[PDB]
Design a protein around this nucleic acid. Structure first.
Ligand SMILES: [Mg+2]
Ligand SMILES: [Mg+2]
Ligand SMILES: [Mg+2]
Ligand SMILES: [Mg+2]
Ligand SMILES: [Mg+2]
Ligand SMILES: [Mg+2]
Ligand SMILES: [Mg+2]
Ligand SMILES: [Mg+2]
Ligand SMILES: [Mg+2]
Ligand SMILES: [Mg+2]
Ligand SMILES: [Mg+2]
Ligand SMILES: [Mg+2]
Ligand SMILES: [Mg+2]
Ligand SMILES: [Mg+2]
Ligand SMILES: [Mg+2]
Ligand SMILES: [Mg+2]
Ligand SMILES: [Mg+2]
Ligand SMILES: [Mg+2]
Ligand SMILES: [Mg+2]
Ligand SMILES: [Mg+2]
Ligand SMILES: [Mg+2]
Ligand SMILES: [Mg+2]
Ligand SMILES: [Mg+2]
Ligand SMILES: [Mg+2]
Ligand SMILES: [Mg+2]
Ligand SMILES: [Mg+2]
Ligand SMILES: [Mg+2]
Ligand SMILES: [Mg+2]
Ligand SMILES: [Mg+2]
Ligand SMILES: [Mg+2]
Ligand SMILES: [Mg+2]
Ligand SMILES: [Mg+2]
Lengths: 100, 83, 128, 115, 101, 153, 211
RNA sequence: CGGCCGGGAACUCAAAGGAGACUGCCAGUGAUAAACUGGAGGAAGGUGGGGAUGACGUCAAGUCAUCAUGGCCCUUACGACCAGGGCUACACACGUGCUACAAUGGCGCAUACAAAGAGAAGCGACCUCGCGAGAGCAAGCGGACCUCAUAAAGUGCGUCGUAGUCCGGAUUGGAGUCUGCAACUCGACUCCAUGAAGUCGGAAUCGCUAGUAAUCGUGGAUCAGAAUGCCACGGUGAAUACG
RNA sequence: AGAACCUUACCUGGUCUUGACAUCCACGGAAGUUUUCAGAGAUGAGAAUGUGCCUUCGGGAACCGUGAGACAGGUGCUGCA
């Protein structure tokens, strides 16, 4: 995909790691059963204030060699085409064509 | 629906705009892009211009609208018939 | 006595049969044949080898089975009893082979294949 | 045999017979019978009027029949008058719970009419 | 003394058995008692990927990464045996995890 | 097929009576591989049929098959540019197969409450030559005798 | 039609993997990514060093890169300097420490990758495709290839319509799994586009296998 | 009264390496042949079963939107960032699937038997609460050990008695749970209530030669959440091939 | 091999122009961390916390911002190059 899209993914990862602790604690107080209701409301407001991209559910896995936003495989971090290419070239250890 | 234990959601910017307008008695329509905020009783009587994606549509908030979302009062697709 | 032993396998089932002379008791997995096989076809299939040899009431067979289902376990038990009886005499060979109980049925589920909704069933074909 | 104006069938096991009431499903039927203290299997035959009156009380607990119909219609009217999207869908006779409309919406659209 | 367990994981059968043979034989030679090898069940992942860059949904490739596991249990260790095992180096690309007790 | 090399699939005798005819009947009545329920229905139907008739436990079944067995049938054939209906004599295995198939169809096409009752009543009616399967057999034989003129082709 | 990659189908039978290491799911992808970056850098930096094969192994917390090349002296440089700089930058790319070994391929004309590189270089340097491919087969058969096949494809000589042409001497059985068929590929970027060159070299069969 | 625990390497099993099956033997057919049919023995008999493997070439087949590239074109915009909307519309048509139309069944109670996989910003047990989706506390497990995870069809007992039904579940109102900055357009699931069409489907047309068709459940990839699709696993398990 | 946002390539509107993404050059500051306001956000104004490492003590490296250029960038057309 576009260089801008790949850079956008990098930016999202950076923000996500930057605001991890605050997001976690704010979520904890928000969902805490035995918590002050006013405190929970304040926590919800703070969480809304926090940057959107900080959320770890706004980042999409992309092929690490092209950027294809579809057909990702977490085991290798690549898309189907690149996985096949590397598998044939014997660069993925252990991967072999199998029949049963 | 949103879980009861989390409460009814509202965007902070809309919260502050409505608070200032209601306290100061202002009647200018509030131009908002937040279609996800929940209509709370403190906003009753205010005119809110919720964006439909092309133009803000004014909606006169009323007692019967409490609890609904703002976006539920701004149709985003124009259908006027095939034939 | 000698505890003549035989392993039997059918579909994905495995049964270990121990034969010992005496009464005609058949205990399967610490349960009775009647309790273990509510299916009378399965009970008859387990009875088959003992009937042909005609040594049914004179042998106590303990059987432990795993895997498969009702009919798979029944077949595994039958094959194991065949092998164990062979262990017991080795004269029965002609009779049991001619009956067909000695053979280990090799039929197995075919693998699901790419492009086919099932092992051989193919998606419906529209001409246009 | 008369419960909020309905002619409960006199040959069907109580709970199923009580299901006839608009507002009394199988769950509520079981609840009503259990609260009254009557076996589910016994049919209306062999049920004395006294048991019928206890069942009448238990049914009276729940909102059933014309009142329930009224509540449903008034809820739809509230949605329609409010001017919301659900009201627009109830006004155009199209799926209101977000089902697809390009095809396979015949239950709401009614039997098909050619072009 | 608690026995020491060595779990060897590899993608190759012959390589993992060569490393296992080295270990068990060394243990036997250095006066240790070894209860191995045990061929634990081998994992086999599978992956199915479209080989056509565009459409052609039915053209696929199935691949597999077979992971073999061998367990060598050395009961009653000795300093001599342990030192021999330490100074013995195993073929690379073969993972070895040592549980102690 | 083209190679004309077919090996008959050997079946096993029914566990209760040891009749391959009964085994085939159970298979024909079976649906979705529910052999347990088809075999239960066949056994129950045989029991009630034996009681109703007043005979042995397999001879009523044989009588019904004897009455519904077709001797001849029609094969479509194109010999000389004409779409002839050639009456061919069917081999005994096919005779039995067709008889059982028709019996099962007639039973399934009845009005009674349960499959065992339907099967029993259909077998009784076939034994007394008054049922749907026997009517189908008579129709087939009438059709063949009508076009007997084209027996060669 | 479409044929399976020879090395791919033969991997584990008569062919070894280029990458040989173990890693759990937590770091398998990271290892693959580092491998790709290292191979790319080394291939570009040694484009003029006749590098035939980059075998990457990952012993413990280190990375050993073995470069199979036909020109060891260029890669090594005077008293190891070039190896040292390559190692020092491979260590940067990998993160973990790195070591580099050099393996000479004695007869480059029997190496599929090197043959493809030669043909590609000639095509880019303006030579007749037929002459180039014929000259590489002749040299391969001379050096003793049991069989060889070269396929050039795409706008040969600047022709408007792309065409495919291939020569083949000896025997190259591609359906025999026990056969040793070293196959590789190259692309020549010329003024009229990309010309693809595929080279198969059959160098005998393997019975014992030995993986 | 649990392989649980001393104990035993017997057996299932777990892999790794080997033996075995080749018309090898017998009889017949056949041209002193290839070859075919039948038989013995055998776990398997004639390619034992299944898969990977796709010749020279045809379709200027498809992909410049995975990628790389020639030529062209834009450069305060056809490049870049952001919020909201759209890809989810709806008079209609075509294609592929799921659910049914009931009694070989629905509902209720008790009860039995699998296989293959996944898990660390993960699987999440036990105990308590909730009708339920779930919640609180929290063991264990980078796993033949811990969890996902009770398989369903079946069997036994009762009821239903051929109804538009105790079949069918669409639609719809109310009230909820979870993930998530946020479920209005536009999620999944739960409970309560409503019970459309449908009573076996024209011409035509598709799949399938045996553990196959048919039927019943299970797992995985993608994934914070979101399969009736895709890919795999097993349980029960046929009819027919005269030509 | 899985569109609420993100994906996203489309539309509305708000914005930027050596640039979201690189190499080079010059200048100025370690980066980094914490909070206020304006705005739908993108950014703009600010404020405290901030002096890290080699250091041949000449200053450098990483990092950030500014400024001019070569250039970047294109999911824009041709699969009949
Ligand atoms: Mg690009
Ligand atoms: Mg996502
Ligand atoms: Mg034989
Ligand atoms: Mg939907
Ligand atoms: Mg595992
Ligand atoms: Mg292919
Ligand atoms: Mg034979
Ligand atoms: Mg072949
Ligand atoms: Mg563009
Ligand atoms: Mg957007
Ligand atoms: Mg779409
Ligand atoms: Mg279906
Ligand atoms: Mg029943
Ligand atoms: Mg149902
Ligand atoms: Mg489950
Ligand atoms: Mg049942
Ligand atoms: Mg129902
Ligand atoms: Mg309901
Ligand atoms: Mg009707
Ligand atoms: Mg009906
Ligand atoms: Mg049907
Ligand atoms: Mg066939
Ligand atoms: Mg299924
Ligand atoms: Mg999963
Ligand atoms: Mg998911
Ligand atoms: Mg199956
Ligand atoms: Mg979007
Ligand atoms: Mg614009
Ligand atoms: Mg083409
Ligand atoms: Mg092409
Ligand atoms: Mg074309
Ligand atoms: Mg053109």
């Amino acid at each position: 995909a576009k260089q801008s899209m790949k850079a956008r993914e990098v930016k999202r990862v950076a923000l996500a790691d930057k605001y991890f602790a605050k997001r976690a604690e704010l979520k904890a107080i928000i969902s805490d059963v035995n918590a002050s209701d006013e405190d929970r409301w304040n926590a919800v407001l703070k969480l809304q204030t926090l940057p959107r991209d900080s959320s770890p559910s706004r980042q999409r896995n992309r092929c690490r060699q092209t950027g294809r936003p579809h057909g990702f495989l977490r085991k290798f971090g690549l898309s189907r085409i690149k996985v096949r290419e590397a598998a044939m070239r014997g660069e993925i250890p252990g991967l072999k064509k199998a029949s049963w | 629906p949103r879980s009861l234990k989390k409460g009814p959601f509202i965007d902070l910017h809309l919260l502050k705009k409505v608070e200032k307008a209601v306290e100061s008695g202002d009647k200018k329509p509030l131009r908002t892009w937040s279609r996800r905020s929940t209509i709370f009783p403190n906003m009753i009587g205010l005119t809110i211009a919720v964006h439909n994606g092309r133009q803000h549509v004014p909606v006169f908030v009323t007692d019967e609208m409490v609890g609904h979302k703002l976006g539920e009062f701004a149709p985003t697709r124009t259908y006027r018939g095939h034939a | 006595e000698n505890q003549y032993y035989g392993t039997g396998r059918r579909k994905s089932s495995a049964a270990r049969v121990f034969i010992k002379p005496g009464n005609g008791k058949i205990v399967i997995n610490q349960r009775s044949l009647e309790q273990y096989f509510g299916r009378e076809t399965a009970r008859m299939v387990v009875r088959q080898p003992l009937e042909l040899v005609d040594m049914v009431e004179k042998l106590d067979l303990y059987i432990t089975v795993k895997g498969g289902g009702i009919s798979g376990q029944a077949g595994a038990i039958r094959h194991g009893i065949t092998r164990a009886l062979m262990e017991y005499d080795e004269s029965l060979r002609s009779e049991l082979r001619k009956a067909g109980f000695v053979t280990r049925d090799a039929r197995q589920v075919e693998r699901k294949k790419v492009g086919l909704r099932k092992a051989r069933r193919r998606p419906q074909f529209s001409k246009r | 045999a008369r419960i909020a104006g309905i002619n409960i069938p006199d040959h069907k096991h109580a709970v199923i017979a009580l299901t006839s009431i608009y507002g009394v499903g199988k769950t509520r039927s079981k609840a009503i019978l259990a609260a009254a203290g009557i076996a589910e299997d016994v049919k209306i035959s062999e049920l004395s009027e006294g048991q019928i009156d206890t069942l009448r009380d238990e049914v009276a607990k729940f909102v059933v029949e014309g009142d329930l119909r009224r509540e449903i219609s008034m809820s739809i009217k509230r949605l329609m008058d409010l001017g919301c999207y659900r009201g627009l869908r109830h006004r155009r006779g199209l799926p209101v719970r977000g089902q697809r409309t390009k095809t396979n919406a015949r239950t709401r659209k009614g039997p098909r009419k050619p072009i | 003394n608690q026995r020491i367990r060595i779990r060897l994981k590899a993608f190759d059968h012959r390589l993992i058995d060569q490393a296992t043979a080295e270990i068990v034989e060394t243990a036997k030679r250095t006066g240790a008692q070894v209860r191995g090898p045990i061929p634990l069940p081998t994992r086999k992942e599978r992956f199915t990927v479209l080989i056509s860059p565009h459409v052609n949904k039915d053209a696929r490739d199935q691949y597999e990464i077979r992971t073999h596991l061998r367990l060598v249990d050395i009961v009653e260790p000795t300093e001599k045996t342990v030192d021999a095992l330490m100074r013995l180096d195993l073929a690379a690309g073969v993972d070895v995890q040592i549980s102690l007790g | 097929p083209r190679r004309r090399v077919i090996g008959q699939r050997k079946i096993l005798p029914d566990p209760k009576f040891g009749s391959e005819l009964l085994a085939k009947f159970v298979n024909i009545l079976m649906v979705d591989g529910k052999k347990s329920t088809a075999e239960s229905i066949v056994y129950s139907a045989l029991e009630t049929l034996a009681q109703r008739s007043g005979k042995s436990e397999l001879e009523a079944f044989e009588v019904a098959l004897e009455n519904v067995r077709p001797t001849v049938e029609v094969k479509s054939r194109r010999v000389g540019g004409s779409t002839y209906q050639v009456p061919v004599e069917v081999r005994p295995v096919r005779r039995n197969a067709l008889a059982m198939r028709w019996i099962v169809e007639a039973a399934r096409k009845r009005g009674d409450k349960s499959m065992a009752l339907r099967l029993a009543n259909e077998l009784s009616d076939a034994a007394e030559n008054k049922g749907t399967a026997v009517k189908k057999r008579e129709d087939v034989h009438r059709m063949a005798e009508a076009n007997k003129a084209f027996a060669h082709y | 039609g479409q044929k399976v990659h020879p090395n791919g189908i033969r991997l584990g039978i008569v062919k070894p993997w280029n990458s040989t290491w173990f890693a759990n799911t937590k770091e398998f992808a990271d290892n693959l990514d580092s491998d790709f970056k290292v191979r790319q850098y080394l291939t570009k930096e040694l484009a003029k060093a006749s590098v035939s094969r980059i075998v990457i192994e990952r012993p413990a917390k280190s990375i050993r890169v073995t470069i199979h090349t036909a020109r060891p002296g260029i890669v090594i440089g005077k008293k190891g300097e070039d190896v040292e700089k390559l190692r020092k930058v491979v260590a940067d790319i990998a993160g973990v420490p790195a070591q580099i070994n050099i393996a000479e391929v004695r007869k480059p004309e029997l190496d599929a990758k090197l043959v493809a590189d030669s043909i590609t270089s000639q095509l880019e340097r303006r030579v007749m495709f037929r002459r180039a491919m014929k000259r590489t087969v002749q040299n391969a058969m001379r050096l003793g290839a049991k069989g060889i096949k070269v396929e050039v494809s795409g706008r040969l000589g600047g022709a408007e319509i792309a065409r495919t042409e291939w020569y083949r001497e000896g025997r190259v059985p591609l359906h025999t799994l026990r056969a040793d068929i070293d196959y590789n590929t190259s692309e020549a970027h010329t003024t009229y586009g990309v010309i693809g060159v595929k080279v198969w070299i059959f160098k005998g069969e393997i019975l014992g296998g030995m993986a």
